[PDB]
Design a protein around this ligand. Structure first.
Ligand SMILES: C=CC1=C(C)c2cc3[nH]c(cc4nc(cc5[nH]c(cc1n2)c(C)c5C=C)C(C)=C4CCC(=O)O)c(CCC(=O)O)c3C
Ligand SMILES: [Fe+3]
Length: 393
């Protein structure tokens, strides 16, 4: 019949943070549904289990938590019907057609500005802070419609809200910083709401103010967008750059056919999912992968692991754009499927990466400053020093 989910008390949060992949290989192999005491959750680690849970909101609710105190209650932590009405108000500025016609040009302007600043910083400098983070910050600033905020504001808001949402230790300074970001955003939105009402434009705020979303939901959804829309594309820029500078075969494929930049982006998010775990809570007794799960159980859907599942892709631990990345779960699959996916892909594959690789000649990793990495709930390079011989634009 149904199996009992084992307790995997050998799984420690510190080890998941430092290197999660060998932990998840063991879990997929021995126990794809497992109770992890330190996490306070059953971790779901197979492709099958994550996918099943993600597509069935009636059984596996998005509405459980720390997210509420950090950010308020956004559409991400609602189920339908309330989710769908908010999501639809959020769609217009992020459709693929609007990204192509309106945003790509703005991204390309921002790539020039930030690549020039990285060039000034000089060979040897960290790419993560030196280019990736301010580029995607200024892009997000434009997408949303924040005329009265700087890219730096956006970077600080993003990290502090994320940190508030994972404040299990209940650090009081962590809560104080997320609260202050929340207040600043509230103030900034007050002024931007007046500005954008009545005023043609293609920013998220412009479309939104033309169903009238209540103010508390505007604030919560904006905070969620900031938390979801900056660190994630920044991380993909780091992963993709590292992967191509680590394999001359992979980089040659791309230079021989630059149409493959899209495939680089899709393979990066399969290989290292930027959002590695998403939470659900069960509403009824259920099962995943033949394991019983009790009503009210809190689950962590480990996308990071699902995208390494050896029954779905051959040699999944390798970065390989020819094998490809068909049906990866990095943007999810149910009714919450990433609204930003087209904006992310354009920023990174269509603009940022080609600009980087065409402007910095002899681009290479630093043999004397090895890249560093961390995270499992969210994962990417913490630092990525690059060197180059000469720089264009
Ligand atoms: C590589 C970059 C990105 C990744 C991997 C990403 C991943 C996700 N984004 C999600 C939701 C979301 N992402 C969102 C805005 C953005 N997301 C963005 C970039 C990324 N977002 C950008 C950029 C955004 C805005 C500009 C929003 C608004 C949602 C919430 C959608 C909903 O609840 O309907 C979800 C939740 C899926 C689920 O099934 O629970 C994932 C996993
Ligand atoms: Fe997203």
């Amino acid at each position: 019949g149904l199996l009992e989910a084992p307790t995997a008390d050998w799984v420690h949060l510190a080890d998941l943070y430092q290197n999660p992949f060998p932990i998840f290989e063991r879990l997929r192999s021995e126990s794809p549904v497992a109770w992890v005491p330190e996490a306070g959750r059953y971790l779901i680690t197979s492709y099958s289990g994550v996918l099943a849970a993600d597509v069935d909101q009636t059984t596996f609710s998005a509405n459980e938590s720390l997210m509420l105190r950090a950010m308020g209650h956004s559409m991400l932590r609602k189920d339908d019907p309330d989710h769908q009405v908010e999501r639809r108000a959020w769609q217009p500025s992020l459709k693929p057609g609007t990204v192509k016609k309106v945003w790509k040009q703005k991204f390309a302007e921002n790539a020039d500005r930030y690549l020039d600043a990285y060039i000034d910083a000089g060979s040897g400098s960290d790419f993560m802070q030196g280019f990736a983070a301010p580029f995607v910050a200024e892009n997000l600033r434009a997408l949303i419609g924040f005329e009265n905020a700087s890219e730096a504001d956006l970077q600080r808001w993003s990290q502090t809200l994320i940190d508030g949402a994972g404040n299990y230790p209940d650090d009081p300074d962590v809560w104080a910083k997320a609260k202050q970001s929340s207040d600043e955003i509230d103030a900034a939105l007050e002024e931007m709401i007046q500005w954008h009402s009545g005023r043609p434009g293609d920013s998220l705020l412009s479309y939104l103010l033309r169903y009238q979303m209540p103010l508390e939901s505007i604030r919560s959804n904006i905070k969620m967008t900031i938390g979801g829309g900056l660190n994630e594309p920044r991380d993909v820029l780091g992963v993709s750059t590292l992967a191509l500078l680590s394999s001359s075969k992979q980089l040659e494929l791309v230079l021989r056919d630059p149409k493959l930049w899209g495939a680089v982006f899709e393979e990066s998010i399969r290989w290292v999912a930027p959002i590695g775990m998403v939470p659900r809570q069960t509403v009824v007794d259920t099962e995943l992968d033949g394991y019983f799960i009790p009503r009210g159980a809190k689950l962590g859907l480990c996308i990071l692991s699902a995208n390494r599942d050896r029954s779905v892709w051959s040699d999944p631990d390798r970065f390989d754009i020819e094998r490809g990345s068909e049906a990866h779960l990095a943007f999810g699959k149910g009714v919450h499927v990433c609204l930003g996916a087209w904006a992310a892909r354009s920023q990174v594959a269509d603009v940022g990466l080609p600009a980087l690789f065409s402007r910095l000649k002899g681009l290479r990793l630093d043999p004397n400053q090895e890249a560093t990495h961390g995270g499992w709930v969210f994962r990417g390079p913490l630092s990525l020093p690059l060197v180059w011989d000469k720089a264009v634009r």
